[PDB]
Design a protein around this motif. Structure first.
Motif, PDB file in Angstrom:
ATOM      1  N   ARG B  93       0.931  -1.213  -0.017  1.00 55.72           N
ATOM      2  CA  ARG B  93      -0.082   0.133   0.052  1.00 55.72           C
ATOM      3  C   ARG B  93       1.001   1.038  -0.145  1.00 55.72           C
ATOM      4  NH1 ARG B  93      -0.975  -2.457   4.577  1.00 55.72           N
ATOM      5  NH2 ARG B  93      -0.799  -4.561   3.985  1.00 55.72           N
ATOM      6  N   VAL B  94       1.461   1.771  -1.037  1.00 59.89           N
ATOM      7  CA  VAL B  94       2.160   2.847  -1.324  1.00 59.89           C
ATOM      8  C   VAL B  94       1.358   4.247  -1.371  1.00 59.89           C
ATOM      9  CG1 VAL B  94       3.930   3.967  -2.638  1.00 59.89           C
ATOM     10  CG2 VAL B  94       4.067   1.606  -2.403  1.00 59.89           C
ATOM     11  N   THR B  95       1.802   5.323  -0.663  1.00 62.71           N
ATOM     12  CA  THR B  95       0.968   6.448  -0.658  1.00 62.71           C
ATOM     13  C   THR B  95       1.244   7.139  -2.002  1.00 62.71           C
ATOM     14  OG1 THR B  95       0.828   6.238   1.931  1.00 62.71           O
ATOM     15  CG2 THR B  95       0.332   8.625   0.759  1.00 62.71           C
ATOM     16  N   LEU B  96       0.103   7.507  -2.468  1.00 62.03           N
ATOM     17  CA  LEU B  96      -0.064   8.230  -3.781  1.00 62.03           C
ATOM     18  C   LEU B  96      -0.192   9.730  -3.819  1.00 62.03           C
ATOM     19  CD1 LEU B  96      -1.632   5.642  -6.092  1.00 62.03           C
ATOM     20  CD2 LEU B  96       0.633   5.549  -5.155  1.00 62.03           C
ATOM     21  N   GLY B  97       0.254  10.428  -4.658  1.00 58.17           N
ATOM     22  CA  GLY B  97      -0.040  11.740  -4.640  1.00 58.17           C
ATOM     23  C   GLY B  97      -1.511  12.162  -5.318  1.00 58.17           C
ATOM     24  N   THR B  98      -1.879  13.322  -5.216  1.00 58.63           N
ATOM     25  CA  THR B  98      -3.150  13.515  -5.659  1.00 58.63           C
ATOM     26  C   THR B  98      -3.283  13.383  -7.348  1.00 58.63           C
ATOM     27  OG1 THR B  98      -4.989  15.331  -5.557  1.00 58.63           O
ATOM     28  CG2 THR B  98      -2.730  16.188  -6.495  1.00 58.63           C
ATOM     29  N   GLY B  99      -4.313  12.965  -7.656  1.00 61.61           N
ATOM     30  CA  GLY B  99      -4.672  12.716  -9.098  1.00 61.61           C
ATOM     31  C   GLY B  99      -4.091  11.418  -9.633  1.00 61.61           C
ATOM     32  N   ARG B 100      -3.864  10.554  -8.650  1.00 65.55           N
ATOM     33  CA  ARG B 100      -3.117   9.274  -8.943  1.00 65.55           C
ATOM     34  C   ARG B 100      -3.652   8.027  -8.386  1.00 65.55           C
ATOM     35  NH1 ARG B 100       2.206  10.938 -10.932  1.00 65.55           N
ATOM     36  NH2 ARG B 100       3.206   9.029 -10.612  1.00 65.55           N
ATOM     37  N   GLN B 101      -4.003   7.073  -9.061  1.00 57.56           N
ATOM     38  CA  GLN B 101      -4.863   5.890  -8.618  1.00 57.56           C
ATOM     39  C   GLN B 101      -4.025   4.557  -8.955  1.00 57.56           C
ATOM     40  OE1 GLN B 101      -6.634   9.452  -7.680  1.00 57.56           O
ATOM     41  NE2 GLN B 101      -7.842   9.184  -9.544  1.00 57.56           N
ATOM     42  N   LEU B 102      -4.313   3.520  -8.014  1.00 62.47           N
ATOM     43  CA  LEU B 102      -3.750   2.283  -8.546  1.00 62.47           C
ATOM     44  C   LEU B 102      -5.034   1.259  -8.339  1.00 62.47           C
ATOM     45  CD1 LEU B 102      -0.519   0.665  -7.219  1.00 62.47           C
ATOM     46  CD2 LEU B 102      -2.647  -0.462  -6.895  1.00 62.47           C
ATOM     47  N   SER B 103      -4.882   0.158  -9.391  1.00 62.42           N
ATOM     48  CA  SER B 103      -5.984  -0.795  -9.415  1.00 62.42           C
ATOM     49  C   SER B 103      -4.920  -2.092  -9.487  1.00 62.42           C
ATOM     50  CB  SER B 103      -6.718  -0.818 -10.581  1.00 62.42           C
ATOM     51  OG  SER B 103      -7.577   0.516 -10.602  1.00 62.42           O
ATOM     52  N   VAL B 104      -5.277  -3.366  -9.079  1.00 62.22           N
ATOM     53  CA  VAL B 104      -4.739  -4.307  -8.715  1.00 62.22           C
ATOM     54  C   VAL B 104      -5.793  -5.376  -9.798  1.00 62.22           C
ATOM     55  CG1 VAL B 104      -4.102  -6.421  -7.522  1.00 62.22           C
ATOM     56  CG2 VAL B 104      -4.209  -3.978  -6.502  1.00 62.22           C
ATOM     57  N   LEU B 105      -5.192  -6.028 -10.834  1.00 63.50           N
ATOM     58  CA  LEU B 105      -5.832  -6.849 -11.779  1.00 63.50           C
ATOM     59  C   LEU B 105      -5.278  -8.292 -11.536  1.00 63.50           C
ATOM     60  CD1 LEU B 105      -5.771  -4.536 -14.574  1.00 63.50           C
ATOM     61  CD2 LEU B 105      -7.369  -4.779 -12.970  1.00 63.50           C
ATOM     62  N   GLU B 106      -6.077  -9.324 -11.113  1.00 60.20           N
ATOM     63  CA  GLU B 106      -5.425 -10.542 -10.696  1.00 60.20           C
ATOM     64  C   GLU B 106      -5.385 -11.411 -11.984  1.00 60.20           C
ATOM     65  OE1 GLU B 106      -7.707 -12.895  -7.922  1.00 60.20           O
ATOM     66  OE2 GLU B 106      -6.219 -14.292  -7.642  1.00 60.20           O
ATOM     67  N   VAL B 107      -4.089 -11.940 -12.255  1.00 63.73           N
ATOM     68  CA  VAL B 107      -3.974 -12.974 -13.589  1.00 63.73           C
ATOM     69  C   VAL B 107      -3.941 -14.311 -13.047  1.00 63.73           C
ATOM     70  CG1 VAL B 107      -1.871 -11.261 -13.729  1.00 63.73           C
ATOM     71  CG2 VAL B 107      -1.244 -13.333 -12.929  1.00 63.73           C
ATOM     72  N   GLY B 108      -4.236 -15.139 -13.929  1.00 62.82           N
ATOM     73  CA  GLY B 108      -4.334 -16.633 -13.780  1.00 62.82           C
ATOM     74  C   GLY B 108      -2.817 -17.071 -14.046  1.00 62.82           C
TER      75      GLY B 108
END
Ligand code: UDP
Ligand code: UDP
Lengths: 272, 272
Positions: B93-108
């Motif tokens: 869980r890294v802290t992000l600056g304003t305007g920045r987002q993170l999504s996790v997509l699980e792979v098989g």
């Protein structure tokens, strides 16, 4: 389709700037391989429209302009010349290569005519097939290749009298009351009004903006110092071009000779 | 917005090629003014998506990759990280600056996973807001600015082991039975699979073409010599990129030091 491999550790040029600070190529000889570009553009069946004005005595320049355009301009690509004139009957019947056509458009302060006329024309549905529009002066002749290396969404051309000048020497419009005004501390280059172009949409936008700016200045009783070139320069300051043409593309040999940084003189002024 | 005037009679660089022969900028330090580019891109509210794979033990590289991306990648612009992983719960869980987002997509084989996965993902409607996609290796850290100078319809990155090599030394796929085949007399550069990108549409097209080529080779019992990098190189040979990133953008300092032509080391390999 084989050609020399690019050399990563060899500069294209050691004597001139070949990319602007916003990463637009500045097009000089030795910076492109026309065989690669010709292929890219022929794969899209690229059609180039060339506008030229020949009003009053300037109809005398059409013969050489069109004869030399047939030898050097976009050869191999689809070309349509649009000749704007008050004397349609005086346009010389020059023989054209395959894939090239010419139309005559009759024209009726007059400082606004070029931007007004290209703006109206560039919005017409009969341009549906044309991909790029290029606008040039008529009192000129081609002497060497001018080809698809120039094509891009929006381009202007370095004025041959000012490419070595600092920005405070540029003859921008300097009065704050004109829509063409540029502060003394601003300006990337001084572009010449005698060669500019781009995609049809970018040329629609530039000529509209310039015509509308000129009409505002007229309403206000002000004429920019160099007329539509002043408004071209304010436009390209605010909407930066995606290629800049070096002065190979707009030269006056009688005035300025053949200096060392010019490897080719491609499109040059006709005297007197 | 004032900045130094460009100098027409001074080369940006005297030691490297800064434009390709098809007039694509090759992006090195001293060839751009980021203040001009930042303005152009912020006027369009540019959103950059960054894909990264962190599968099996490579989830250990995410912490530094995301901490340093927050210091150096596209700061000031809208950014969305898409982390493809088999261990979503291990993503730090890294802290992000304003305007920045993170999504996790699980792979098989799994050699096809990156081009297959980016292809499927790049076609999803939830990307409607993202303007450009950039795809990078995870076992890397940013050490200096990587910003909107790289953005363009389609870009690849010069492999840091081969930028000085002649084309016959490039490790292209050389078997005619593979869809990745490039003749010994062809090739502009050798691009690395570890940093490429472009507009969403150009990334959809590149990853589809590469995935489809890889599936043909699999059907035929052939695996290209360097897997998806081989197919990246055949793709960018035939669809030339509109910018090329210099090896400032993909470097291995332990392997190759800090040679004179690199003014900045921006994104570098993490050891062992
Ligand atoms: O930095 C460069 C050097 C060359 N070229 C072009 O690529 C072609 C071949 O270049 P080369 O210098 O190898 O010329 P050759 O010695 O083979 O005649 C010519 O059209 C050059 O203008 C280019 O676009 N960028
Ligand atoms: O050919 C050049 C020379 C400089 N710059 C950039 O324009 C800005 C100012 O350049 P200058 O060399 O004038 O640097 P200064 O001496 O003012 O710090 C910096 O971001 C440079 O990298 C550029 O894009 N192209």
């Amino acid at each position: 389709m084989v050609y020399p491999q690019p050399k990563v550790l060899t500069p294209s040029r050691k004597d001139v700037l070949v990319v602007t600070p916003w990463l637009a190529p500045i097009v000089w000889e030795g910076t492109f391989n026309i065989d690669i570009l010709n292929e890219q553009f022929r794969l899209q069946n690229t059609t180039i429209g060339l506008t030229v004005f020949a009003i009053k005595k300037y109809v005398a320049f059409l013969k050489l302009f069109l004869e030399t355009a047939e030898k050097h301009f976009m050869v191999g690509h689809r070309v349509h010349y649009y000749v704007f004139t008050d004397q349609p009957a005086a346009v010389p019947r020059v023989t054209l290569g395959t894939g090239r056509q010419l139309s005559v458009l009759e024209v009726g302060d007059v400082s606004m005519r070029r931007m007004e006329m290209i703006s109206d024309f560039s919005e017409r549905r009969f341009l549906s097939e044309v991909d790029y529009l290029v606008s040039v002066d008529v009192d000129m002749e081609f002497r060497d290749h001018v080809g698809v290396e120039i094509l891009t969404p929006l381009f202007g051309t370095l004025h041959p009298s000012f490419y070595g000048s600092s920005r405070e020497a540029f003859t921008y419009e300097r009065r704050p009351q004109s829509q063409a005004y540029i502060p003394k501390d601003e300006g990337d280059f001084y572009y010449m009004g005698a060669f500019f172009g781009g995609s049809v949409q970018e040329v629609q936008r530039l000529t509209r903006a310039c015509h509308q700016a000129m009409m505002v200045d007229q309403a206000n009783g002000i004429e920019a110092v160099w007329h539509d070139e002043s408004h071209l320069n304010k436009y390209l300051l605010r909407h930066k071009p995606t290629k800049v043409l070096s002065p190979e593309y707009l030269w006056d040999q009688q005035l300025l000779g053949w200096p060392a940084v010019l490897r080719k003189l491609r499109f040059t002024a006709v005297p007197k």
